[PDB]
Amino acid sequence: FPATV
Amino acid sequence: FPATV
Amino acid sequence: GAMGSMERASLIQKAKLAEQAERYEDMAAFMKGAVEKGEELSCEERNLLSVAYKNVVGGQRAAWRVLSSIEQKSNEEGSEEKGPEVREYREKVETELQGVCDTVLGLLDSHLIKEAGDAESRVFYLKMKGDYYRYLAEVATGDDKKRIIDSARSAYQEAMDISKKEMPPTNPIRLGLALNFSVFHYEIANSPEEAISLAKTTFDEAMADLHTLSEDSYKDSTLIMQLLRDNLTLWT
Amino acid sequence: GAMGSMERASLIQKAKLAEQAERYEDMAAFMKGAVEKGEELSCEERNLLSVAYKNVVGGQRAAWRVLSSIEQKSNEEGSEEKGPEVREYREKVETELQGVCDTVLGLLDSHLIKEAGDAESRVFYLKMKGDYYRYLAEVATGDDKKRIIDSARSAYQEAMDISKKEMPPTNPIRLGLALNFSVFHYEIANSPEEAISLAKTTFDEAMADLHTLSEDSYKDSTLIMQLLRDNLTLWT
Ligand SMILES: *CC(=O)Nc1ccc(-c2nc3ccccn3c2Nc2c(C)cccc2F)cc1
Ligand SMILES: *CC(=O)Nc1ccc(-c2nc3ccccn3c2Nc2c(C)cccc2F)cc1
Ligand SMILES: [Ca+2]
Ligand SMILES: [Ca+2]
Ligand SMILES: [Ca+2]
Ligand SMILES: [Ca+2]
Ligand SMILES: [Ca+2]
Ligand SMILES: [Ca+2]
Ligand SMILES: [Cl-]
Ligand SMILES: [Cl-]
Numbered sequence: 001f002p003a004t005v
Numbered sequence: 006f007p008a009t010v
Numbered sequence: 011g012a013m014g015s016m017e018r019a020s021l022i023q024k025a026k027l028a029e030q031a032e033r034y035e036d037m038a039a040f041m042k043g044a045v046e047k048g049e050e051l052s053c054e055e056r057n058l059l060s061v062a063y064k065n066v067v068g069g070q071r072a073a074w075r076v077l078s079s080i081e082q083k084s085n086e087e088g089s090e091e092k093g094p095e096v097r098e099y100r101e102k103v104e105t106e107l108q109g110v111c112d113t114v115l116g117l118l119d120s121h122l123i124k125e126a127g128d129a130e131s132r133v134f135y136l137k138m139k140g141d142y143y144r145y146l147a148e149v150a151t152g153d154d155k156k157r158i159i160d161s162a163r164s165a166y167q168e169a170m171d172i173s174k175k176e177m178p179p180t181n182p183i184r185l186g187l188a189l190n191f192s193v194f195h196y197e198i199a200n201s202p203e204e205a206i207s208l209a210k211t212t213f214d215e216a217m218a219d220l221h222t223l224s225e226d227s228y229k230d231s232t233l234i235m236q237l238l239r240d241n242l243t244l245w246t
Numbered sequence: 247g248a249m250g251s252m253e254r255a256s257l258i259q260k261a262k263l264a265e266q267a268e269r270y271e272d273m274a275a276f277m278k279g280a281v282e283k284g285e286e287l288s289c290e291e292r293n294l295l296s297v298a299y300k301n302v303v304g305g306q307r308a309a310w311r312v313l314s315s316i317e318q319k320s321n322e323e324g325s326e327e328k329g330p331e332v333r334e335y336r337e338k339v340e341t342e343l344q345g346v347c348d349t350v351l352g353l354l355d356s357h358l359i360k361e362a363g364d365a366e367s368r369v370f371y372l373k374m375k376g377d378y379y380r381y382l383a384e385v386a387t388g389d390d391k392k393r394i395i396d397s398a399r400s401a402y403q404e405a406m407d408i409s410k411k412e413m414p415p416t417n418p419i420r421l422g423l424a425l426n427f428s429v430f431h432y433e434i435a436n437s438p439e440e441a442i443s444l445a446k447t448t449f450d451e452a453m454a455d456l457h458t459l460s461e462d463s464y465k466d467s468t469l470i471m472q473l474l475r476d477n478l479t480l481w482t
Contacts, residue, residue, distance in 0.1 A: 002193050002244055003237040004141070005186040007429050007480055008473040009377070010422040023331045027316065031309040033339070073267040080263065095259045103269070 013043025021047075025058045034065035038110075045117045050125055056134055063114050067145055070107040074149060077103055104149050111142045118142075129176035130183060136169035137187045140194065147198050159198055166191040179215040180223060185234040188212040192241065206245055213238045249279025257283075261294045270301035274346075281353045286361055292370055299350050303381055306343040310385060313339055340385050347378045354378075365412035366419060372405035373423045376430065383434050395434055402427040415451040416459060421470040424448040428477065442481055449474045 013021060021044040028037035041059040045051065051059065077100040083089060084096050118139050126132040143162035150158050170191060173184040188208055196205035216235050220228055249257060257280040264273035277295040281287065287295065313336040319325060320332050354375050362368040379398035386394050406427060409420040424444055432441035452471050456464055 002196065002241045004190045004193050005234065005237065007432065007477045009426045009429050010470065010473065020329070020331050023328070024335050027313060027332065027335050030316070031312040031339070033309050036338075073269050076267040077263060080266070092259070093256070095256050096263065099260050099263050102272075103267070 011043065011046050013040065013046070016043060018044055018047045018049065022055060022058070025062065029058070029061065034062055034069075038062035038066050042113065042117065045122065048121075050131070051122070053130070056131065059117075060134075060138060063110065063142075067107065067110050067114075067142070070103060070110065071145065071148065074100065074103050074107060107149060108146060111146050114142045115139065129172055130181075133169045133173050133177070133183050133187060136165050136172070137183070137190065140166035140169065140187075141190055144190075144194050144198055162194060162198065166194060178219055178222070179212075180219045180227070180231040182230050182234055185212065185216060185231060185238070189234065189237055189241070192238070196241075196245065202245065206242065209238045209242050209245075213242070247279065247282050249276065249282070252279060254280055254283045254285065258291060258294070261298065265294070265297065270298055270305075274298035274302050278349065278353065281358065284357075286367070287358070289366070292367065295353075296370075296374060299346065299378075303343065303346050303350075303378070306339060306346065307381065307384065310336065310339050310343060343385060344382060347382050350378045351375065365408055366417075369405045369409050369413070369419050369423060372401050372408070373419070373426065376402035376405065376423075377426055380426075380430050380434055398430060398434065402430060414455055414458070415448075416455045416463070416467040418466050418470055421448065421452060421467060421474070425470065425473055425477070428474070432477075432481065438481065442478065445474045445478050445481075449478070 016024075021040045025037050025040040025044065028034070028040060037058070041055075041062050044055065045059065077096065081096045081100050084092060118135055123132070123135045123139065126135050140162045143158055143165060147155065147158045147162055166187070169187050173181070173187055177184045189212070192205045192208040192212070194205075195201040195208065213235055216231060220231065223231060252260075257276045261273050261276040261280065264270070264276060273294070277291075277298050280291065281295065313332065317332045317336050320328060354371055359368070359371045359375065362371050376398045379394055379401060383391065383394045383398055402423070405423050409417070409423055413420045425448070428441045428444040428448070430441075431437040431444065449471055452467060456467065459467060
């Protein structure tokens with residue numbers, strides 16, 4: 001999965 | 006801590 | 011309100027203890043109680059709220075994905091029928107996840123966003139609104155899926171508009187908002203080109219503003235910039 | 247019984263799904279429902295029960311230790327008074343932990359142990375009884391602490407007596423029982439010499455019986471033997 005914050 | 010199972 | 015009898019300051023204190031103990035459900039319950047006191051949240055308190063729910067919903071999303079994959083495999087050709095249990099349990103986890111999202115969206119709507127006038131607070135809360143609608147969108151399969159997606163988009167877009175007008179390109183909230191909106195484009199809106207363009211433009215505009223920063227601000231901003239780069243590497 | 251309307255086989259199936267999703271609270275609730283159907287548990291089902299509650303209580307114990315350490319530091323000389331909140335929250339976690347232990351002990355008492363006649367099942371359940379009384383002992387500070395410790399000791403001792411008569415020295419349940427009873431001696435009963443003697447004697451008697459085993463049984467037994475060795479290394 002891609003990075004989120 | 007020591008090992009337990 | 012289960013937390014109605016506890017002092018605001020005690021709820022905050024206990025949220026911090028719960029974080030140290032990795033008790034994120036408790037942390038979220040304490041922060042919900044703190045929000046329901048009706049006062050605005052400080053920067054630190056907003057971050058406690060977000061950390062708590064991020065961790066709770068993050069765990070639910072991971073579990074949902076495991077169960078959805080099992081369910082998908084159960085529906086392939088050649089797979090032996092195992093009854094309604096996989097679907098039922100995936101639905102149970104899904105309903106719990108939706109409940110947490112609805113709780114967060116409820117706090118934002120009653121009344122955090124409407125009382126947030128400073129750019130830093132308003133953008134923070136609007137990013138949260140986009141994020142929790144995005145989580146609803148991840149599991150949506152019915153008549154309202156398009157409307158859920160559009161609710162996420164709308165919240166992110168309002169946050170983006172404010173952030174571009176009111177915050178420098180290296181501001182961590184601005185950067186994190188763009189990171190997540192970029193992921194929305196890629197994973198939810200079927201818009202990989204928009205995702206890539208946003209991540210690139212955000213990275214490059216931040217790069218050009220790093221010279222203005224202290225050592226400590228530089229560290230913060232560059233950490234998030236690396237996440238943009240990581241996504242770009244994944245997608246190209 | 248919240249799970250009273252669900253089929254036994256569906257509860258088992260869902261416990262296995264919950265394990266895959268790392269949803270240990272759900273796993274424990276499903277297995278509690280399965281026990282309350284009233285039928286005996288198979289080997290695999292006993293292991294589902296134990297895994298679920300081990301993970302739930304393990305998380306509670308870790309959180310309790312974090313909070314207890316903070317509380318201890320708050321009560322040192324020079325520490326600034328921060329009010330009742332640390333104690334209150336440690337007490338909250340402690341009460342939750344005690345509740346889980348009481349739930350497990352209740353399942354064992356109503357009626358898993360009394361219906362367990364084979365050595366493998368009876369020893370398994372008696373080990374659990376010792377373990378959950380040990381967890382109660384870890385947090386006990388009142389009039390009943392001695393009685394809690396003695397309840398753990400008594401359960402472990404009955405399990406040990408059966409295991410020595412009925413199981414080979416390499417049997418994994420026998421080995422794990424001895425590992426945990428040894429820890430009881432060291433950490434709860436203030437008997438480090440007994441702890442060390444038990445771990446050593448258990449290891450050496452298992453070593454001498456390995457020649458009887460298949461490759462797969464050898465792997466299982468040697469894994470647990472290494473835990474005995476690890477504890478011995480920590481303690482000597
Ligand atoms: C007052 C306020 O909200 N400030 C703030 C500043 C920075 C962050 C932050 N910093 C990093 C560094 C690396 C990875 C993540 N983060 C975050 N997290 C974050 C959040 C929670 C929301 C929006 C952007 C963002 F970067 C948080 C809060
Ligand atoms: C039917 C039955 O209960 N069988 C069984 C056999 C082995 C284990 C086992 N094997 C290992 C290997 C490494 C570490 C731990 N374990 C365990 N766990 C365990 C348990 C849950 C209880 C008692 C002893 C023990 F080793 C479990 C169950
Ligand atoms: Ca007050
Ligand atoms: Ca659903
Ligand atoms: Ca305001
Ligand atoms: Ca039935
Ligand atoms: Ca207590
Ligand atoms: Ca029986
Ligand atoms: Cl279910
Ligand atoms: Cl509390």
